[PDB]
């Protein structure tokens, strides 16, 4: 299976989890409580955890910024080698 899907973990719990990771870019996808039925991406960066809304379009694609994907899986894999962040280079990598 994919090791990055954490189901309905609350935002705060995701932060507590990720804050213990060793590498920037360690991440999870979670089922948002504030946008029920939508997804959120949480990522370690330094002493912070950053959160991204997984946006959706009229065809049901998934995206963070402007490039769009047919699945969460494809969005995640894209962002292993293209930054999630517009402020810092952050590449997704699986939790350890």
Author numbering: 57 to 152
Task: Paste lines from the article.
Growth-factor receptor-bound protein 2 (Grb2) is an adaptor protein that has an SH3-SH2-SH3 domain architecture. The Grb2 SH2 domain mediates activation of the Ras pathway through binding to phosphotyrosyl motifs on either growth factor receptors such as epidermal growth factor receptor or other adaptor proteins such as Shc. Grb2 SH2 specifically binds to the pY-X-N-X consensus sequence where X is any amino acid; however, it binds to pY-(L/V)-N-(V/P) with higher affinity. A number of signaling molecules such as Grb2 and phosphatidylinositol 3-kinase (PI3K) bind to the cytoplasmic region of CD28 and activate CD28-mediated costimulatory signaling.
In this study, we report the crystal structure of Grb2 SH2 in complex with a CD28-derived peptide consisting of 8 amino acids, including the pY-M-N-M sequence, at a resolution of 1.35 Å. In general, the folds of the Grb2 SH2 domain were essentially the same as those previously reported; consisting of a central, antiparallel β-sheet flanked by 2 α-helices. The phosphorylated CD28 peptide binds to the Grb2 SH2 recognition site across the exposed edge of the central β-sheet. The phosphate moiety of the phosphotyrosine (pTyr191pep, the amino acid residues of the CD28-derived peptide are denoted with a “pep” suffix hereafter) directly interacts with the side chains of Arg67, Arg86, Ser88, Ser90, and Ser96. The side-chain of Asn193pep at the pY+2 position forms a pair of hydrogen bonds with the main-chain amide and carbonyl groups of Lys109. The 2 methionine residues, which are unique to the CD28-derived peptide, appear to contribute to the binding mainly through hydrophobic interactions. The peptide adopts a bent conformation similar to the type-I β-turn, which is the canonical conformation of peptides bound to Grb2 SH2. However, the hallmark hydrogen bond between the main-chain oxygen of pY and the main-chain nitrogen of the pY+3 residue (Met194pep in our structure) is not formed. Consequently, the CD28-derived peptide is slightly lifted away from Grb2 SH2, making it a more “twisted” conformation than a canonical type-I β-turn. A very strong electron density, which was interpreted as a cadmium ion, was observed between 2 molecules in the crystal lattice.
